[PDB]
Amino acid sequence: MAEHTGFWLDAWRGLRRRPKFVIAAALILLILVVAAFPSLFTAADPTYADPSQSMLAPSAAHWFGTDLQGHDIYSRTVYGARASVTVGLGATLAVFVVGGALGALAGFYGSWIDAVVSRVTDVFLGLPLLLAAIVLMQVMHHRTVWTVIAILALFGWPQVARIARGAVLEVRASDYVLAAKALGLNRFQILLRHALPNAVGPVIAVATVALGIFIVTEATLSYLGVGLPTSVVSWGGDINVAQTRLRSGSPILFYPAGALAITVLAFMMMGDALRDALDPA
């Protein structure tokens, strides 16, 4: 998606009265409000654990119960929204932009640009994530949200690059590409204006799935001490720690997982509503 000029005013009007778009936008707005102002929804401290209240059932005092340590689960699932949403959205946008640009450049030119980009992709694609995280985080004096985003994006862009390259390969032999060349455009203007809008669906799909994948992988990183300091509440850290209480019959894993699934659903609906505005019917 580079140049959809012309009538964004008609698209936006055609996108307004689209119930899927409206519902997805309302859900996204709610999620953002929860991630921005957590103190409207709860008064408790997410990092306070009274251990004489280890694993209680939901009541009027604790709406979701407590966990093995004694934390309030409602407070923790309200305050994990900031970290989880920030990491997921940041890494998704980063890999989308970077991998899409790289793969679309590779698939369109194809002489030596393709060679270098595809070899770098084959190297980055076979190198594990935990090894490189362990090696790189020995120089970062402080873990943050942005270091986690940087790691996740730097090792997640290749599979988006592959899909974008494959998508542009099919398009670059079309007849409107020759017509654009015969009008007088250069290869870069052709690329943007004609070949980005026409080959952008698959990338949207893989991005909408990579969002939830990233939100889950950040916990893998945090658990070993190479990401996101332990004083930070997050969805995924809670799932990781609470999955072990499941044999005893305690279903406290499904409270952060429910929020994660709702956010992923909202963004999938939004992505499809945006993708159905490039070939309306």
């Binding site: 076979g126 190198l127 594990p128 290749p158 592959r162 494959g166 669906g201 799935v209 699934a261």
Partner: protein
């Protein structure tokens, strides 16, 4: 094209060499010191430690240890694995099972994802499409540990219609439930890619002509619509063939499989450099080869795609 394939296979060599150097560097740069863990949770005598450090050549300069590693892979001779074994034996014991399991998982996910995706893209916005999408997102949200735990519980403990463990006996029939579990995180990807492509291609001008011939809906759908909508999903499947190996550590722990992911994790946590370097190098080889094969498959799938 013969000359294009020749150039590709030729340039595969120097990238392989540079990748070996870069991988050895990043594995060397792990923060600890292997000798400090050779005795486990007890300390070594300061003379026994010196002896072991000199025995494993852990006091040579970098690039001397690298040249020693690299010049010896011309005889096999990949290293010596502080447990005392050759590394050749370790890799030969660990790779066959992983290859078999990865092939099973790829086949399962391919068949299932393509079927559900073609139907959900032919009739999108309906009950079937909604159910498929919510199944994908529910699979994403729930950790693979829980999925493997519950699947094993059910189908191996209550309904004994599957092995609980596949240790030491890894048939193509005993590795079927582990394969289904392993190929479940790659379900939403395949479904969504197939759905997008099929929805885009379901309204071309030649599909109307194929309908006017008098073909049945299955034949029209399959031949025209499906055959014309296979490139992004094949891209993803080729790229995921390599991630199915080296990254199935959680599934191989639930079922006692003894694959490559556990070997890699142990070698990393004990800082055994030759083992890690060999495994990661083999992974990079697999990726190079599969990407070349998938490009040739592009050329076979679309006659207007030609390289030069």
């Amino acid at each position: 094209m013969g000359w294009y394939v020749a150039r590709r296979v030729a340039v595969m060599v120097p990238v392989f060499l540079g990748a070996t150097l870069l991988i050895y560097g990043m594995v060397f740069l792990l923060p600890g010191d292997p000798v400090a863990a050779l005795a486990g949770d007890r300390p070594l005598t300061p003379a026994v430690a010196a002896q072991l450090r000199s025995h494993y050549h852990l006091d040579d300069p970098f690039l001397v240890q690298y040249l020693r590693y690299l010049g010896g892979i011309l005889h096999g001779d990949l290293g010596r694995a502080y447990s005392g074994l050759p590394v050749s034996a370790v890799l030969a014991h660990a790779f066959p099972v992983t290859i078999r399991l990865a092939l099973i998982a790829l086949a399962v996910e391919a068949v299932l994802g393509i079927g559900f995706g073609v139907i959900a893209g032919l009739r999108q916005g309906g009950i079937f499409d909604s159910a498929v999408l919510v199944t994908g997102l529910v699979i994403i949200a729930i950790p693979i540990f829980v999925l493997g735990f519950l699947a094993q519980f059910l189908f191996g403990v209550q309904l004994e219609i599957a092995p609980v463990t596949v240790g030491e006996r890894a048939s193509v029939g005993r590795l079927l439930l582990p394969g289904i579990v392993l190929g479940a995180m790659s379900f939403a990807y395949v479904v969504r890619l197939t759905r997008s492509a099929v929805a885009a291609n379901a309204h071309a001008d030649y599909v109307r002509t194929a309908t006017a011939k008098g073909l049945s809906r299955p034949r029209v759908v399959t031949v025209h619509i499906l055959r014309n909508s296979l490139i992004p999903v094949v891209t993803f499947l080729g790229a995921d063939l390599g991630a199915l190996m080296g990254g199935a550590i959680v599934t191989e722990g639930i079922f006692n499989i003894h694959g490559v992911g556990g070997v890699l994790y142990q070698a990393v946590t004990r800082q055994e450099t030759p083992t890690v370097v060999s495994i990661v190098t083999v992974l990079v080889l697999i990726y190079l080869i599969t990407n070349l094969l998938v490009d040739l498959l592009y050329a076979a799938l679309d006659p207007r795609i030609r390289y030069g």
